[PDB]
Amino acid sequence: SGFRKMAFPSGKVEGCMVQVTCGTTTLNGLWLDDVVYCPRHVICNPNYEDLLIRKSNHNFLVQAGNVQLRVIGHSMQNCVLKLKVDTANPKTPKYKFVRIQPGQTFSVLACYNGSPSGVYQCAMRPNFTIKGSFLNGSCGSVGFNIDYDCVSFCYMHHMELPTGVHAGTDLEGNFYGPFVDRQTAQAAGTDTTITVNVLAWLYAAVINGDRWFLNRFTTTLNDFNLVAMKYNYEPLTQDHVDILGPLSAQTGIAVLDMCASLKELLQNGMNGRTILGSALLEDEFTPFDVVRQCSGVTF
Amino acid sequence: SGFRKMAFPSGKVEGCMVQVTCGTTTLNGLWLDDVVYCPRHVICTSEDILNPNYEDLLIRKSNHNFLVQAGNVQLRVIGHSMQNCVLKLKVDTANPKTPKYKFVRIQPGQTFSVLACYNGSPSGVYQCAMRPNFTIKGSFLNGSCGSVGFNIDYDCVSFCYMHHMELPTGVHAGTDLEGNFYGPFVDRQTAQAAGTDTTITVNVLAWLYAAVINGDRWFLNRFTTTLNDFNLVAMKYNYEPLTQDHVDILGPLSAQTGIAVLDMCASLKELLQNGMNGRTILGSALLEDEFTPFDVVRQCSGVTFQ
Ligand SMILES: *C(=N)[C@H](C[C@@H]1CCNC1=O)NC(=O)[C@@H]1[C@@H]2[C@H](CN1C(=O)[C@@H](NC(=O)C(F)(F)F)C(C)(C)C)C2(C)C
Ligand SMILES: *C(=N)[C@H](C[C@@H]1CCNC1=O)NC(=O)[C@@H]1[C@@H]2[C@H](CN1C(=O)[C@@H](NC(=O)C(F)(F)F)C(C)(C)C)C2(C)C
């Protein structure tokens, strides 16, 4: 037993990380087959479309470990630059590019000079930011899920907002949230709590013998969602209640039963108690995360 | 900016994990050059685990009683030897993916990454601390035994923990990679309970310095303290004594923030006296003790946000 904020094994992604230099700008690239993907801001209100067509190939210094890759082509896709190189990455995993929804979780491999430094677990916030841990040179660091042996890349890191939270794109260069890759004034919107994830975490508490917060009462979506949006919680939809099904049977607490416990916790707080060693309601574990860690699924 | 329970990238440990089978017992092993290291209780059956005589169970085994599997490849065992509570299986192939490594015994308070494994396949990576009472708060199911804890320093992997068992309080016990248990535990299903746990004071102070570095000062006060007055108060909250070594180790974080270690001790003292006042620090409503001074310096700017 035990419950931990657990990342995916980073091995397969570690094999894809390289260093990209264009002038004084250094950051991280993802080398898949014969293409390196990185933030287009490496070339730097700029003018990218124009800037890149001007720039020749030997201007992009691409270092993989000690080796250098020769760039035989460039091209823009939204906010990501694609650098064509002479050689396919022999360590290339089975992979795809996915776009995740807010509330969905993923593992970040934090990198500096194409060198992996750390791995942590993240949720795409409702306001399309992530609460990451990123310094200078972190740009091009990626977010991923692993499904059997297939790496789904969902995030590339671009920037830090003034509140200390982070913004990036999918691997096709589409931003998460209403942001731009320009030195301009940008803020995170007001965030909400991922209700379905809090409930999933309460089910993990129960599975691990942490049960003081349960009660006799049940509720309805309406009454709950009226209390929720008061405490800046996402609406719990009927889809959410379906996903929690597995955990509701496996424990014998009913989702609208668990909604009554969570209501009670929002109104009365914790009474100097913890749940799985937290004094806050944790919203960065999906139902899938909880079933996977409490089942022991491997990669 | 930001502050996360970061683990080390697991790739270099992933390439070492194998599955070890003895009769009906399968657990994970660690394949480094031509040796596979695993918990010796792989040779135990259901009837052995209360008073196993390992020397006696082992003398009754051939090399070919050990099935070792690295992905699809069954490796061939050519030698076996017990060292403390680890079995070492000599195999015909040296692991081509063996990293630069060493084995280290860590002290309570020290952190490391755990690669949770089942059937020699990795399930996930998380960060742990050796609790003062020599346990870890892991996430570990049936078959997780042989999973390892590690730090990475440039390219070199220091193996510090191997998982053996779960104690009645839901917390975990294991050995160094020389097979010597952390704490007063034994690889037997006999009555075993963890010492009462304590908060790792030096680590909480480190994490308060992290909070100042990311620009949060709401919990500082204008007081100082003697180390001894601080320790007299800290013991009353089940905090580990802070020693002069601990104060020395905090020197750098003190210099980066301009806040004296004993002034940070005055803040912690007040935080214990009052709690959070419905406020949080680095996203936690509790005082965090699983970040070392080395961790904070590693993950934090080097330039304080004010
Ligand atoms: C990539 N290597 C860095 C990562 C940053 C640095 C501090 N922590 C991080 O996550 N990315 C950048 O430097 C990007 C890059 C220009 C400016 N920038 C920022 O992150 C800046 N923020 C913003 O521009 C703002 F306000 F809009 F969010 C900075 C002020 C340096 C934090 C570009 C092209 C956006
Ligand atoms: C390794 N595969 C397991 C790991 C355990 C299983 C559940 N969670 C874990 O981390 N190791 C064992 O099953 C060891 C093994 C015999 C018994 N054992 C235990 O962990 C048991 N606990 C104890 O014996 C206790 F509490 F006294 F320390 C168990 C009750 C099954 C969790 C041996 C030889 C110690």
Author numbering:
A (entry chain B): 1 to 44, 51 to 305
B (entry chain A): 1 to 306
Paper text:
Mpro substrate recognition has unique features and is specific for Gln residue at P1, hydrophobic residues at P2, and small side chains such as Ser and Ala at P1’.
For nirmatrelvir complexes, we determined the crystals structures of the WT enzyme, as well as M49I, N142S, G143S, Q189K, A193T, and A193S mutants at 2.1, 1.9, 1.8, 1.6, 2.4, 2.5, and 1.9-Å resolution, respectively. In nirmatrelvir WT complex, the S2 subsite is occupied by the dimethyl-cyclopropyl-proline substituent, which interacts mainly by hydrophobic interactions with the main chains of R188 and the side chains of H41, M49, M165, and Q189. The same pattern seems to be maintained for all mutant crystal complexes, including mutant M49I. The structure of M49I in complex with nirmatrelvir showed that the mutation has also a minor effect on ligand orientation relative to the WT, where all key molecular contacts were maintained. Mutants M49I, M49T, N142D, M165I, R188K, T190I, and A191T exhibited a catalytic efficiency significantly higher than the WT, with increments up to 2-fold, with N142D and R188K being the ones with the higher relative catalytic efficiencies.
